[PDB]
Design a protein around this ligand. Sequence first.
Ligand SMILES: [Cl-]
Lengths: 525, 98, 95, 93, 93, 86, 87, 107, 107
Amino acid sequence: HDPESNKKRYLLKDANGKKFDLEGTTKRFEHLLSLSGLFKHFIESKAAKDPKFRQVLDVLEENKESIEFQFRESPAYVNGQLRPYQIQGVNWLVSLHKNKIAGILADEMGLGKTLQTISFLGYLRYIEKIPGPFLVIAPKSTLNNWLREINRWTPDVNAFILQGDKEERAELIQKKLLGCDFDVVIASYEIIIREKSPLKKINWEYIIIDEAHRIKNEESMLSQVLREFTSRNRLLITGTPLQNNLHELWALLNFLLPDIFSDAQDFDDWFSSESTEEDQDKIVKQLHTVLQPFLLRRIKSDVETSLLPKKELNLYVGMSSMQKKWYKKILEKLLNIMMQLRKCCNHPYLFDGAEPGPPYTTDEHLVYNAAKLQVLDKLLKKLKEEGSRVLIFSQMSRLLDILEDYCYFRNYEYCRIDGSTAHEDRIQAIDDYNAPDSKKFVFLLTTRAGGLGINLTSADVVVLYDSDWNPQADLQAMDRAHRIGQKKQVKVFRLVTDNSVEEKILERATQKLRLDQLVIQQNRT
Amino acid sequence: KPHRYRPGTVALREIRRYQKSTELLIRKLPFQRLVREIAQDFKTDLRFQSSAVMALQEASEAYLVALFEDTNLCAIHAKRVTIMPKDIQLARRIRGER
Amino acid sequence: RYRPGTVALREIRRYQKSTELLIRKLPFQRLVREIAQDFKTDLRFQSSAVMALQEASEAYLVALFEDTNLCAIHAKRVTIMPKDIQLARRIRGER
Amino acid sequence: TRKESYAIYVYKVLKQVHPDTGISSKAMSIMNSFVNDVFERIAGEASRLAHYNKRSTITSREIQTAVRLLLPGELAKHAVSEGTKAVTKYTSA
Amino acid sequence: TRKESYAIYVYKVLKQVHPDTGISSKAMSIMNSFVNDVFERIAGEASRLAHYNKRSTITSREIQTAVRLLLPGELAKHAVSEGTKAVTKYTSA
Amino acid sequence: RHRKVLRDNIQGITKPAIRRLARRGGVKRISGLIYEETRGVLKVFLENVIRDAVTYTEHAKRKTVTAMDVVYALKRQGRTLYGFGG
Amino acid sequence: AKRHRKVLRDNIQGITKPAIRRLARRGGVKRISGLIYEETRGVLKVFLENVIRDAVTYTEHAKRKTVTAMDVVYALKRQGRTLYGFG
Amino acid sequence: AKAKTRSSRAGLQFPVGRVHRLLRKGNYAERVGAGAPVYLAAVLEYLTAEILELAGNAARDNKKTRIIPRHLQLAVRNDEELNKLLGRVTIAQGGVLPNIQSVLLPK
Amino acid sequence: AKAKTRSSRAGLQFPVGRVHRLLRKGNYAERVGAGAPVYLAAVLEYLTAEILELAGNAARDNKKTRIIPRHLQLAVRNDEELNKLLGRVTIAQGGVLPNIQSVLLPK
DNA sequence: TCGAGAATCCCGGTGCCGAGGCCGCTCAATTGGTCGTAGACAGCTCTAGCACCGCTTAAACGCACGTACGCGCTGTCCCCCGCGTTTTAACCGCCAAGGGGATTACTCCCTAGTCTCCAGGCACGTGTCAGATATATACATCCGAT
DNA sequence: ATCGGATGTATATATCTGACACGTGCCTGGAGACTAGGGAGTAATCCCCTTGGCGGTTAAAACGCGGGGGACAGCGCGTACGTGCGTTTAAGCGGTGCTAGAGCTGTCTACGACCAATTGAGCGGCCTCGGCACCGGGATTCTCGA
Ligand SMILES: [Cl-]
């Protein structure tokens, strides 16, 4: 094409391009109701106020082409060959498009992700002959990764990153966005919020959003902005759907298909608010088939083999005396939240004035006023003979400070990554620790930090020195060392304090983890 | 030699710029930190509403602006154009806060 | 013959120690009941009413001079001036 | 949940002086606070004025004296004239 | 007639704090004015507190809040101590 | 009652009276233009206070001004006077 | 030593030099000395102590652990600095 | 009979009934008169009309057809009687009147 | 039975019946608690005793036996935070605190 | 002294979200009817205000003088402003779980208000004396000219 | 440095008047029933505030340097004050008369409180579409070396 052909089609033909289209919604209703009959609940729920969807129901009910182009082994337009299951995923995506609906891709991280995405976009451009636009929203750390992937396995397209300062972004927008000189626009979340108005006035085909779990709260500004965007269909990429609740799965679905899953109350009354008998069991959970067509997930135990599994263990430490007195002080009464309980369960010196004196000393007395730290010290001493390097996680960097001072008190070699360390020093740190012969025994980290590109694959043991409300965050921290790469047995040691709130945190985490287990994992297929 | 204004001609421009707008001239977060660590004295474990902190900042800014105006009059009366701590001390002493 | 300043300081010490009335009672009464007839006509007054008016008036004037003096000192003088009063009662809020 | 305010009357006075001028929300809050403050001042002064004369009833005479005390200059004059006019009209009706 | 005052009580407090000093008529009148002014200030603050919290009764809690809100620092602490011990003795007896 | 309307009685606030008030204020040296300012400010203060006192007197239906009314006016202005009532 | 978080800059130093300069400009001053930047901080701290003290007294009389805007308005009106636009 | 509001009988806009109730429940006196709410409503109406007229004039001067706290501040502070009435009051988001001391201007 | 005044019950000297009656017929609230008059009387008695012992100390400092408004003014103005309480108050036949500025004094 | 250049204001031309109508509901304002008592209104009393007249004698007033002080001018540092350049913290957003507070809806109990009686507390009218002025009077103690 | 005035400052004595003590009565505070309703306790629920942390943008904030103009000091001078002394003048006291109007008592209406029934006026919730904020760009204007 040429820029003028792009201008005649991309821009919104009308002032208000947002309006109710009947053909598409009728097609969706007929196809889905052909697939299964449970959807009548949603349709009657949405027809309560607005009755034109009820006449759609009537016309599609009383009256009782998605060509099976299997799109086999990798076509030449995408360079090279690739995983057959990835062809299966692309076939899934093609059929999803040909049924005029969208669907979450929930492949586990590292299992050839975004490759099926670029291949599907190439399929759209060559078999469907349709050019752009294609908005791609990814975290900033992956913008250049996406661009490189696109330009090295399907180079004969147009794709640029929309990053830069205010003026550089503005000139780039006027040159290309308003210039209509693209096929795919790589952009970041913050950029999507920033450049709302220019991006609205485009007739979008798809809006690919990688790590879709970021959109899980429907009061989030990004969700509102994406709702305000006009587009023909959507596509979602995320490895951990339904992280800590069932409602957020509906939140993903609503953005996916805003005409099907348009009611929160219907979905949360589908299963959640009924716990008396088998009605909280096999039948109601098998009613999941509503979630069957909209999602696909695959595991690292179907594909690459390798990576021996995990050996998660629990180390039930016992409260220490100073911990005991601080814990009793906290319980009955600065301190303004229950988080103080978890702080005390971790190490008393986090509270001010816990260090005696203070004359500032860093002697052996540190482990004395700590329950978990003594077990940690013994564990490190035992592991030192076998020389297995260590990744310690935590929830507070302020705790990592105490831990690292302990670390160099016993003459060990650590290396930190926190929210305050910049990008370049982070990269040099990960290079140093991952050196072919690195003289840094332990490595420190925060559970919800560093993004996903970190490749700390050189070690074998990972202690979750503190737990998290969301088990998914801990799982990300664990696969941070359990990803493809590391081949020795990854060993993970969570530390739990007895007779304290940490038991309750672990128990709720297990509830949410097993909820995730029953909702998705068995029906993952 | 690049263009350079003479002293005072940017000061008056800022005077007439700021005497025309209405926004708050102090940053929100430092002021909130200030009146939380001040409130820690009289009673501990307090929760502050955003509206309460906003009202506090409005009142304090108005107070300081009026005080600086009277300090300016004191400095002018002393045949000067620069304000000094003695002017503020006199302004607060006259009005009755000292 | 004393030098300029001595008698003034002794007068300051004298009048900062007594409590009696510095304005003449009958002139003050004439002024008060002259000002009065601009609001309502043919008024009568209580002796204690005029006394209270005088007690408030002199207190006001003394408090004003105690600020006029500070304003004068702030300008590196010892003399008080109309501009000193104007500044004092403009800062105090009376405009 | 039901909170009463003078907004609906201030925006009837506004549409009689400037029939085509709107008013923002913050200005509306300021207007409500202003009428509340003036009501408090007048009522307190009238209550004290009644207590001084050993009267049990607060009425239009105390209201007139209180507005003549609180309001400066021509403002008090016009307010008193308007109050007398309204009272006479009401008692005639 | 029969104008009431606090002279008979101020004199008792004087004779128990300084057993052999007197007080003139003007000073007694000033003390009476002081007592009335402070009583009015405290009662007004207590009334505004009770109206603020939508209570319909003045009580020792409102009086204590008013005194701690009106008197500066050290005077406030001693006044609170005096009031609490007086009320405890009254409740016991 | 008879022969009471007078003029220029502000000249009765004599210059030595101003100087005595200045001495009680602790003023050592006095300029010559100061007396007109003092007379003006005293007249303004008296006008305000007397206006309020006459308002109270008129409301009470009296036509004699009482020290208690003067006290009310002063207190309303914010200059509470101790000694004459209340 | 890095166990102990290094003591942060004092909170009263959060009223920076440019902020005081902006307040003085709105007040209408042209030149500014170098000690105003601490005299003003002292004055602001004192004013804040007074208003906070009154507001806390109100909010603990009401049996609440929450200072609220209407309590702040009450405190300001008590001091004689009535504020319109918050209650 | 037929209801007929006291405000309408007085020819006013402010709520005479609600003013009466506030006077009666505010603990101002033992019992309120009958013309007191009418007089007070009239006075409040006058003051509000004055403030709003001046503020609308300021808004028209600033070429905006909507009153804002800046316009209220300009209206109040540019009139002597209103400024004396509201001397202690501070208007939130009000600002300051433009003012530069004469000796501060360039020679 | 023989009556016992509430002021005698509480061990106070100011009248509690009079304080209760004033709080009642003073238009402060609809209802008045029973401990409030006692607490208020105690506070008033405290303040009176404080200012009065200061005045007596001043009177003895001037070799006088009786107390006069000059002594009251001396006590109040000399005592900080009692000066702050009586900040805007004017005491008749009081005076001023002896005070001369430093620069006015002879070399 | 007039050009050079930076700041500002005024046009159009987007966008977005707050004001401003519109509707249903409910609950306080209105109407009608007692009734108990503030408070006009009249009448009587006598206290405090007003008005002069006279004396006396201290505070004001006018005039001289001479002398510190306020004011203007001149230098000179120095310190504060204006402009560049680099760093950092404020400001959005987002996550997790709690408790806090504001409603609304109740239940119930104890503590006020309302009476009726009745004696002591206090207010007023007196009748004393000593604490506080008034006069002198001697002493000590700044202040100013040699 | 010394000496000579002039001004507080102790010291004794007389005068008086104002504070303090004492007797009466009358009105108000206390005692004792009786009650109702205001406030305490409980319990749903729905939204806001806290604490610790992370990731990203981007204006402010901080630091540095030059240099100019303003503050501060010193000096001269020419008034404009302070001090002191005669001499008018009017304020203060002391008394008298005249009277109005401030205050207290009776009483008997109008008028405000309270209650029931009723109903529109105002309040909360929703939707929308102009008014205003924002962003160039072009033109004006206002300052600063010559
Ligand atoms: Cl991935």
